[PDB]
Write a protein that binds this DNA or RNA. Structure first.
Ligand SMILES: [Mg+2]
Length: 193
RNA sequence: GCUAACAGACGUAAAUUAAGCUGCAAAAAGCGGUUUUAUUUUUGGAUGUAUACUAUCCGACGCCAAACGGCGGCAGUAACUC
């Protein structure tokens, strides 16, 4: 069902085709490659896939669901940002579009660089601040795919983890520069778990 | 005219974070005050709002004080009596 790169390099990364191989892995891989080819030039070779990519390949996801997922991923993030995000860690495709929308909106609320913890600068320069907030959240997602797993802790504990990082030295603007340069949120999320 | 009226529970409603503006003496940090926001918790009417809700009366429709509730006597006047 996949005359292409051999299964030997792919059986060591994906243990999903042991059970639901026939229509499942081949059609989902073909539809995902076509769904990213119809996007802005994404190849999606299967070698980069990690064993945590049981999602988007498990028996029960339709190819139409993958088509909606990639369309929602290039709708929630800009396709230049979505292409930069998908260059590293394709595990973002595992999330459902509604849950990914919820996590991105919660990240935009807590990490709002425009104003307060509330979504500052509601939509001339308010739209400019809102676009900067979308850029900041997509840059954090490019830097770390694990920030999309915030609702495992809570939608309201993103601020709690951010202050657990915040209490050491100074205020928010220094920390938006600091957290974008180093992954300080991973220890805070592990401390919350 | 809305946290409505009306009907009930009655000795009185507040709990946990977050952001902002801050302030005190001070060798590189602690505790606060105030405004806004988030989660709860905040009985029906009502997740309603004067074309809506409640109360009272008449009980469709058709034709000519809509609050309790009625709406007098005396003794005579019209070419035969009355
Ligand atoms: Mg009236």
């Amino acid at each position: 069902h996949w005359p292409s790169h051999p299964v030997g390099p792919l059986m060591g990364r994906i243990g999903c085709p042991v059970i639901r191989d026939p229509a499942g892995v081949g059609h989902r891989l073909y539809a995902l490659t076509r769904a990213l080819k119809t996007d802005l030039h994404y190849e999606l070779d299967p070698h980069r896939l990690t064993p945590e990519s049981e999602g988007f390949l498990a028996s029960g996801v339709s190819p139409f669901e993958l088509e909606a997922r990639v369309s929602a991923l290039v709708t929630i993030f800009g396709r230049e940002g979505a292409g930069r995000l998908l260059d590293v860690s394709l595990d973002v495709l595992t999330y459902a579009p509604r849950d990914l929308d919820r996590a991105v909106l919660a990240l935009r609320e807590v990490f709002s660089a425009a104003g307060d913890r509330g979504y500052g600068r509601h939509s001339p320069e308010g739209a400019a601040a809102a676009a900067a907030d979308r850029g900041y959240v997509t840059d954090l997602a490019v830097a770390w795919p694990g920030v999309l797993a915030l609702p495992g802790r809570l939608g309201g504990a993103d601020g709690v983890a951010r202050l657990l990082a915040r209490v050491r030295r100074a205020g928010g603007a220094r920390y938006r520069g600091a957290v974008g340069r180093r992954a300080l949120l991973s220890e805070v999320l592990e401390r919350p778990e």
